[PDB]
Design an enzyme around this catalytic site. Structure first.
Site, PDB file in Angstrom:
ATOM      1  N   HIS B 120     -36.010  65.376 110.227  1.00  0.00           N
ATOM      2  CA  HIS B 120     -35.278  66.424 110.962  1.00  0.00           C
ATOM      3  C   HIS B 120     -36.117  66.892 112.203  1.00  0.00           C
ATOM      4  CE1 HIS B 120     -32.129  67.113 107.816  1.00  0.00           C
ATOM      5  NE2 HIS B 120     -33.062  66.608 107.015  1.00  0.00           N
ATOM      6  N   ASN B 193     -27.338  70.179 104.623  1.00  0.00           N
ATOM      7  CA  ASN B 193     -26.916  69.063 105.466  1.00  0.00           C
ATOM      8  C   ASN B 193     -25.401  69.160 105.762  1.00  0.00           C
ATOM      9  OD1 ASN B 193     -29.505  67.868 105.725  1.00  0.00           O
ATOM     10  ND2 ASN B 193     -29.083  66.248 104.252  1.00  0.00           N
ATOM     11  N   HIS B 384     -37.536  76.569 104.210  1.00  0.00           N
ATOM     12  CA  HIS B 384     -37.951  76.035 102.930  1.00  0.00           C
ATOM     13  C   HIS B 384     -36.915  76.459 101.870  1.00  0.00           C
ATOM     14  CE1 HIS B 384     -40.282  75.319  99.411  1.00  0.00           C
ATOM     15  NE2 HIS B 384     -41.469  75.785  99.766  1.00  0.00           N
TER      16      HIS B 384
HETATM   17  C1  HEM Z   1     -30.305  67.751  99.456  1.00  0.00           C
HETATM   18  C2  HEM Z   1     -31.239  66.945  99.992  1.00  0.00           C
HETATM   19  C3  HEM Z   1     -31.943  67.470 101.211  1.00  0.00           C
HETATM   20  C4  HEM Z   1     -31.513  68.373 102.167  1.00  0.00           C
HETATM   21  C5  HEM Z   1     -30.177  69.031 102.400  1.00  0.00           C
HETATM   22  C6  HEM Z   1     -32.648  68.539 103.104  1.00  0.00           C
HETATM   23  C7  HEM Z   1     -32.493  69.195 104.335  1.00  0.00           C
HETATM   24  C8  HEM Z   1     -33.529  69.387 105.279  1.00  0.00           C
HETATM   25  C9  HEM Z   1     -33.431  70.010 106.550  1.00  0.00           C
HETATM   26  C10 HEM Z   1     -32.199  70.632 107.187  1.00  0.00           C
HETATM   27  C11 HEM Z   1     -34.666  70.009 107.117  1.00  0.00           C
HETATM   28  C12 HEM Z   1     -35.051  70.615 108.460  1.00  0.00           C
HETATM   29  C13 HEM Z   1     -35.309  72.137 108.470  1.00  0.00           C
HETATM   30  C14 HEM Z   1     -35.503  72.519 109.907  1.00  0.00           C
HETATM   31  O1  HEM Z   1     -34.573  72.559 110.695  1.00  0.00           O
HETATM   32  O2  HEM Z   1     -36.738  72.809 110.335  1.00  0.00           O
HETATM   33  C15 HEM Z   1     -35.564  69.359 106.181  1.00  0.00           C
HETATM   34  C16 HEM Z   1     -36.931  69.244 106.389  1.00  0.00           C
HETATM   35  C17 HEM Z   1     -37.813  68.576 105.515  1.00  0.00           C
HETATM   36  N1  HEM Z   1     -37.449  68.146 104.307  1.00  0.00           N
HETATM   37 FE1  HEM Z   1     -35.639  68.205 103.385  1.00  0.00          FE
HETATM   38  N2  HEM Z   1     -33.767  67.943 102.655  1.00  0.00           N
HETATM   39  C18 HEM Z   1     -33.384  67.299 101.530  1.00  0.00           C
HETATM   40  C19 HEM Z   1     -34.281  66.681 100.705  1.00  0.00           C
HETATM   41  C20 HEM Z   1     -35.676  66.605 100.887  1.00  0.00           C
HETATM   42  C21 HEM Z   1     -36.562  66.073  99.877  1.00  0.00           C
HETATM   43  C22 HEM Z   1     -36.206  65.450  98.525  1.00  0.00           C
HETATM   44  C23 HEM Z   1     -37.850  66.281 100.307  1.00  0.00           C
HETATM   45  C24 HEM Z   1     -39.121  65.847  99.626  1.00  0.00           C
HETATM   46  C25 HEM Z   1     -39.372  66.157  98.306  1.00  0.00           C
HETATM   47  C26 HEM Z   1     -37.728  66.884 101.626  1.00  0.00           C
HETATM   48  C27 HEM Z   1     -38.811  67.115 102.491  1.00  0.00           C
HETATM   49  C28 HEM Z   1     -38.602  67.686 103.740  1.00  0.00           C
HETATM   50  C29 HEM Z   1     -39.790  67.901 104.577  1.00  0.00           C
HETATM   51  C30 HEM Z   1     -41.219  67.545 104.180  1.00  0.00           C
HETATM   52  C31 HEM Z   1     -39.291  68.485 105.706  1.00  0.00           C
HETATM   53  C32 HEM Z   1     -40.047  68.939 106.921  1.00  0.00           C
HETATM   54  C33 HEM Z   1     -40.049  70.508 106.903  1.00  0.00           C
HETATM   55  C34 HEM Z   1     -40.985  71.070 107.939  1.00  0.00           C
HETATM   56  O3  HEM Z   1     -41.774  70.357 108.547  1.00  0.00           O
HETATM   57  O4  HEM Z   1     -40.954  72.417 108.247  1.00  0.00           O
HETATM   58  N3  HEM Z   1     -36.381  67.155 101.943  1.00  0.00           N
HETATM   59  N4  HEM Z   1     -34.865  68.998 104.991  1.00  0.00           N
END
Ligand code: HEM
Ligand code: HEM
Ligand code: HEM
Lengths: 735, 745, 251, 83, 84
Positions: B120, B193, B384
């Site tokens: 993202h 999402n 988060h």
């Molecule tokens: C339902 C499944 C998922 C959804 C809806 C989701 C959604 C998102 C979204 C929207 C962001 C961006 C937030 C922003 O705008 O700064 C993001 C960031 C991220 N996601 Fe998820 N995610 C999903 C699953 C996962 C999973 C399974 C993991 C790992 C266990 C993960 C790890 C991350 C990480 C590491 C970031 C970077 C956040 C940051 O750097 O501040 N995500 N996710």
């Protein structure tokens, strides 16, 4: 099991004895506290500007960093009482994550330090010599933040080590931050900044085993010194009692380098900065300082904090040695050579203003640890010179601060922020606090009508312009031949010392070189000393079992420094400047103290601003002859003589403490350390433990009772700091 | 008048004192009022809309930095006299180490960049507010949902998934929709999402799936595309991915705007009331602007003509006052109903059909202000899903469970330490007090004598708060846990084809054609043919019509065994659910849409007056296009300003095209003018031709009698504009699909 | 890899001129120096280490399938770090504190770290309290005093309000808190772990290190004064015993 | 330094010289090289002053800057010749 | 349960080791500025062993209450009074 459950609620004692009084109190009377809670009425422009980032605690709910109230801060979330911890415990993970990431790199050098808030005020306008705004008006108050430090040791090393001390002042000027980053000696060890990692690596713990901490008493340091005679001058200062100050309040400060002052007409005057302590110059003796790194490794940090809490504000006079541009080549030494001092006998120190340290920080990490001082931080009215050590420092400080403080926005850390406006086209970087609204992030720009804009140089509120110094020469990596003199300044320093200071320099070199494993290094250092002074070299050689060659005895002494053989301003003690305010006396109690003695002792001490600590064989209380209940501050072992300036033993039931090993040793240690001792009535029986004859001696105050004459005698001895005349007697003392 | 000359032609450009450089007419400054896209230069939010405010925007005033009438200084507050030159020994000499002004300026520049988000990384954000319709105290004790008059400030970030921070907006990808709620009881982040499901079941597989979709490790290709071997290799070997893949291959993967897509939390969470009762919940965001998507050729070409299209459109809609609006919705399932469905509620690869559990309207969110500085507010924002408040709780969903660990961990390195909550955008607006200390960039100066608890030295403050109906401490729902410590997928999650089938049969035939084309195009980019064949084999377990159509486009022949694959069962008796289609149920709004108006050198003013009046009445924007910039003069003498050239703002950037009458011969033989219409035609956009502009029907191969989707009349008037606006309300002319294949565009 | 001709001087315009920005040799040398320090450990920042080897007396295949414990002839290289707890990396060795005893086993089936202390128990029960306990024992936040000492208000405040701490407090208050050498102290894993055999049977285990040199401690006055006379006493004694061939040995 | 996490970026495999490199620089984040030199400074006698400076010469010599003549006042000024 | 393990440790020590434990607590608590903290620690020691608490209290000028002198010692650990 209630200790393992939410919540324990009110735990403070009903009498409110957990809270220190928000008023000036003597050392040990109240628990120490963050500055804003101890002295809320003590304020300045910088302290006031920090209010927006100050965080309270009273009557607030315990929360996560996201503001979520915590119900149970005693337990992890688990599947059952005795089950595994769950990954979903976001409260535990946030609390542990923050803890896991608390530490930042310590400073490469000067890692060990103690800091305070205060203010600077000039005596008169210096507009004739400088256009610096902070020195333009006697009524202009400039907030300051000062950090005092050792050099070699880590942030967790001891205070009373033998080392050079740092003395860094951050001036929060109306025209920008000016940092005066100096040391407690007027010279540095090296000439060119290129050698800084070589010198530092040599003095620091050796790379294979990381030994020794806070000590120059090892092979690599003396190896470097023996092969680099330019280091001899600062080494002489480090080996003297200058290397073991009594307190940060009792040492001098110096900028070392020649800088320039620039006036409104563009005239440059060469300047060397000085800090003159109001409390005078005072140092420990080696044995006392070394043992004090054991008994209290936080001695200086504690003394600084407690003096400010008592209202015994450290005070320093800012002084300038001023040299006109046309006088650049009038001296035997190069003005740009940082291994050379400017004798006060040739160029006097002109008193320019006074700095008062009147408030401790609230949080050591946030204010002291995160503070960033840089000698490159100058303001219009000041400029640099070609001193090759200063030149290199200009690069180093900005560079180190990026990794130590996690990025280029370290100026946004509250303690580092200017109090005057700051606006530019710089953007982004890790932990960016400032939100820029400027449509333009570049200049020249038309989209914001070219704002923020350049300001032409002028008499006041003008832009910074460098002095147009004429530069002529080929691009060379070469030391100026003018810097190639290494013995006259160490000789000048040596001859300026009293015989007892000279004995301490000899003992300093002897002790340090005895710790060097490779004997040839000791011999090479003794050979260097023979080029300085033959008496010094012979005395050190004798203590090391080294015999000087006929050739070494025939070494021609170095010349005088512009006709000077000595300068009494270089001695700690030659010219008396001893003040008693803020000093501490141990009072050795017994189970039936003569109250008349104690009343007279305390009354006389209070009249001079001299603190007292009531000591006994245990804690609690003792009852005087008249029924007065006396609270015990510490035990004899708890607050050793090392921690006090003098010892007073009042009369009463002396038999109670006469056979106490700790009581007798307390006096023997203070005796060996040259401290004034006062014995009243039956306490005079303690003369036997210190091998003093019935007729007595200078430095031992004695009478039938502690009264007017008795206390005046002791306070006069305290004004002289130590009993130097006692030196021939200490060698026989087993202490 | 319009002949502004540069103030700098000589060596004065290399000297201090350039002083005032703005034009005398003040045309450098945008109006601090709502203006349509391209009418004024875009500006920081606090300068464009200073009267637009909320509790969070107001709390950021202490860190806002001005510029006007201020001296240029170093970061230490030292006034700079010359910001054009380094300090040197002579005017042609070497630069000196003592130049602290140069070094501070270059140092800060050298350290501007921070790591981008692992996923993202490409995103666009805005400030706004949320307000519930009524108190939800019966189902949740969450403070932000307790009173219809309680306004909660928000910060929303929309994003793509695969691409870097510098990647293009209109890629084929899933979109992120993250909302930070600044509640009175803590920050709640709803991190969702634009699809109701995720690709994987367990968080342990997240680096495997992400590495497969991301650029390949040897050469770092392709950017913002799943159209490569590794992605399809993973999909072919992991059928749990098929459901989200179906959504990504549909027009859902190419939204028209962030304002025209849905939002979902995906996971089942819990709502906790004051009595301790838990209700299972799935979060939804319903767009007020309705659901609308691009078409593949249009989206791909738009990544070229305007890689910043979505970021741009979001920023301009707020600047115009066409605020993105979304209704918050809850699918509520009682605890006793946990096992009542064919699918596991904790399986994130499964959606809850709206036909089984309806989405209950809970409140509305309005995005009404852009940030001031993209880096400080957007780049540094940290969302988060672990950031919940009392009244909310998690479930054992194995993907959500792992997400709880990931976000805190990544934010430490991305934001340089554990004090990232002190970064202005991340700060709660409610109080925060604890015993945590130090860490890199520590802003807060703690005065508490105690940095531990239990303590007597500060009378145990800050203190724990017991759980309660309002303003109480957080307590986890006492869920019963029974089982052995295992690394094992629940058998209940082991079904992969019914939800992709449900989605497929819920689509209109044209949406189905677009899914087929999506798979066909992507698989054609896979180099290893066996991977294409393995994916087609997976499609045969979903729907035979889908598999056959994809196989045909790939020159693949299905085996007799593949043609005999038993279709997967219905989802609790449902074969389809029209809520899963973008277009089945009409919800098209015209407000905020854009029309390209193709001008000529002598435009019929009566047509232009009627066109603009009717568009303005509906809040539809217009861009006046020509073969060059400047102005054109109308038949009556009206001076018309040109917004862009035909090449400058292509048809991809607009929703419809209007060609008024006048001197048509001027543009009749213009390649760009004809291609503009051919492109808009191919992309199914409404086209309106007035008078002699009807001669353009020849370039789009339309017969004299005309066709549906092509508005035509002698003049642009009442009936003409009503016809075009009705076509715009239907978004695209789907009936035109059989005709576009013959069009060379 | 560029050969340096003069490592005594910066590049300047004349022998008494300003230093030039083009001196890449000076800037590289100073940049590296400026960036030498890394954060110290949050706890156990003061520590001394050595290389060695582990060898089991006999196969323990009946109770564990751990490869390093499967064959008496299997030599496992080790890296051991001994430490204090409270003090910084620059603090003294002979303080009154608990000592760390961490062993890194470079096994053929992965790295196994046995991260223990010189007492068989810890101060606290739940990891959630770790920052509370550590903040209480560490230097007080206002003034950052005292270094390497639990002899201050916040530590004893926490202990008085958390009786679970009493057991490890008793050990710290005893001569166990002032060891003569790292060679003359015991080591413990503290926690109950599990051993798993090839049949899947779990046996509860608590790890111990028994010093071949025996158990020996200083007396308080000597330990305190020794933090002054030689703050590197334990680090030195460990290094020198190894250089003398008096290898620290533990069962 | 910030992009590559410290002063040892020359130890990242792609950045490493293929020719020898030896000096008195030590530590820094992610230090790969394990220095065995008893000395981490120069001049030193403990390692007989090794590694040593090399005088400039026709081949395999130390780096020396061309002794360009510099004449001018310390100024923040663009050369008129650039105008 | 917080007192039986500290008691087992205490009883397992030699008289010289016990004297050193008493001196350790006495020295440390003498450095505690707030006297009520010292008193609260001595109260905890009274729940471990009365000889230990009295010896520490004496060195601190603290007098144990009649209630403190009547604190029932914690139980042995699975029958052991000491472990050498
Ligand atoms: C339902 C499944 C998922 C959804 C809806 C989701 C959604 C998102 C979204 C929207 C962001 C961006 C937030 C922003 O705008 O700064 C993001 C960031 C991220 N996601 Fe998820 N995610 C999903 C699953 C996962 C999973 C399974 C993991 C790992 C266990 C993960 C790890 C991350 C990480 C590491 C970031 C970077 C956040 C940051 O750097 O501040 N995500 N996710
Ligand atoms: C006249 C000779 C010198 C004096 C008086 C001096 C003084 C000081 C002082 C007092 C500090 C500590 C300021 C604080 O309280 O945080 C310090 C820090 C330091 N000095 Fe110098 N110094 C000298 C020469 C050098 C040289 C030649 C260099 C390198 C070229 C250097 C590099 C540093 C560095 C890297 C720090 C740590 C800065 C930080 O982390 O914020 N110093 N110096
Ligand atoms: C049975 C109780 C414990 C024992 C025996 C123990 C022992 C140790 C030892 C010996 C080290 C130093 C390893 C080294 O020489 O680098 C250490 C480091 C550390 N411990 Fe523990 N520990 C315990 C509990 C805890 C707890 C409860 C936590 C946190 C929840 C914790 C966090 C740390 C951290 C963060 C480090 C620094 C590790 C590093 O920076 O490499 N420890 N511990």
């Amino acid at each position: 099991s209630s200790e393992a459950k939410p919540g324990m609620d009110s735990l403070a004692p009903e009498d409110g004895s957990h809270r220190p009084a928000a008023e000036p109190t003597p050392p040990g009377a109240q628990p120490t506290a963050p500055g804003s809670l101890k002295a809320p009425d003590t304020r300045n422009e910088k302290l006031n500007s920090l209010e927006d980032v100050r965080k309270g605690s009273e009557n607030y709910a315990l929360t996560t960093n996201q503001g979520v109230r915590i119900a149970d801060d005693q337990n992890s979330l688990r599947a059952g009482s005795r089950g595994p911890t769950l990954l979903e415990d976001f409260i535990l993970r946030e609390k542990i994550t923050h803890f896991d990431h608390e530490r930042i790199p310590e400073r490469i050098v000067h890692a060990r330090g103690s800091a305070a808030h205060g203010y600077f005020q000039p005596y008169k306008s210096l507009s004739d010599i400088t256009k610096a705004d902070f020195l333009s008006d006697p009524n202009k108050i400039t907030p300051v933040f000062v950090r005092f430090s050792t050099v070699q040791g880590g942030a967790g090393s001891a205070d009373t080590v033998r080392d050079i001390r740092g003395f860094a002042t951050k001036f929060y000027t109306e025209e920008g931050i000016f940092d005066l980053v100096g040391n407690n000696t007027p010279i540095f060890f090296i000439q060119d900044a290129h050698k800084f990692p070589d010198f530092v690596h040599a003095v620091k713990p050796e790379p294979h085993w990381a030994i020794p901490q806070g000590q120059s008493a090892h092979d690599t340091f003396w190896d470097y010194v023996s092969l680099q005679p330019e280091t001899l001058h600062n080494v002489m200062w480090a080996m003297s009692d200058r290397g073991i100050p009594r307190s940060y309040r009792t040492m001098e400060g110096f900028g070392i380098h020649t800088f320039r002052l620039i006036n409104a007409e563009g005239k440059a005057t060469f300047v060397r900065f000085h800090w003159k302590p109001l409390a005078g110059k005072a140092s420990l003796v080696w044995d006392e300082a070394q043992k004090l790194t054991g008994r209290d490794p936080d001695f200086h940090r504690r003394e600084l904090w407690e003096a400010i809490e008592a209202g015994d504000f450290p005070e320093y006079e800012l002084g300038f040695q001023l040299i006109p541009e046309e006088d650049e080549f009038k001296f035997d030494f190069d003005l740009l050579d940082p291994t050379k001092l400017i004798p006060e006998e040739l160029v006097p120190v002109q008193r320019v203003g006074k700095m008062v340290l009147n408030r401790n920080p609230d949080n050591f990490f946030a204010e002291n640890e995160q503070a960033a001082f840089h000698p490159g931080h100058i303001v219009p009215g000041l400029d640099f010179t070609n001193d090759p050590l200063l030149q290199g420092r200009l690069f180093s400080y900005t560079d180190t601060q990026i990794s130590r403080l996690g990025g280029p926005n370290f100026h946004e850390i509250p303690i580092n922020r200017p109090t005057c406006p700051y606006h530019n086209f710089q953007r982004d970087g890790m932990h960016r606090m400032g939100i820029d609204t400027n449509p333009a992030n570049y200049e020249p720009n038309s989209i914001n009508d070219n704002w923020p804009r350049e300001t032409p140089p002028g008499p006041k509120r003008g832009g910074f312009e460098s002095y147009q110094e004429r530069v002529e020469g080929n691009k060379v990596r070469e030391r100026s031949p003018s810097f190639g003199e290494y013995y006259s300044h160490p000789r000048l320093f040596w001859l300026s010392q009293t015989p007892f200071e000279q004995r301490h320099i000899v003992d300093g070199f002897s002790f340090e070189l005895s710790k060097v494993v490779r004997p040839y290094i000791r011999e090479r250092v003794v050979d260097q000393l023979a080029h300085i002074d033959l008496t010094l070299a012979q005395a050190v050689a004798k203590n090391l079992g080294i015999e000087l060659t006929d050739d070494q005895l025939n070494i021609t002494p170095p010349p005088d420094v512009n006709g000077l053989k000595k300068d009494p301003s270089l001695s700690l003690y030659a010219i008396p400047d001893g003040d008693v305010k803020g000093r501490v006396v141990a009072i050795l109690l017994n189970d039936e103290v003569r109250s008349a003695d104690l009343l007279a002792i305390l009354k006389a001490l209070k009249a001079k601003g001299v603190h007292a600590k009531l000591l006994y064989s245990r804690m609690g209380e003792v009852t005087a002859d008249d029924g007065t209940v006396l609270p015990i501050a510490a035990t004899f072992a708890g607050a050793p003589s090392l921690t006090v300036d003098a010892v007073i033993v009042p009369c009463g039931n002396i038999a109670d403490i006469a056979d106490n090993g700790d009581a007798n040793y307390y006096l023997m240690e203070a005796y060996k350390h040259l401290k004034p001792i006062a014995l009243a009535g039956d306490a005079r029986k303690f003369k036997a433990t210190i091998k003093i004859a019935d007729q007595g001696e200078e430095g031992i105050v004695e009478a039938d009772s502690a009264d007017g004459s008795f206390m005046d005698e002791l306070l006069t001895l305290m004004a002289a700091h130590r009993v130097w005349s006692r030196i021939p007697k200490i060698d026989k003392i087993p202490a």
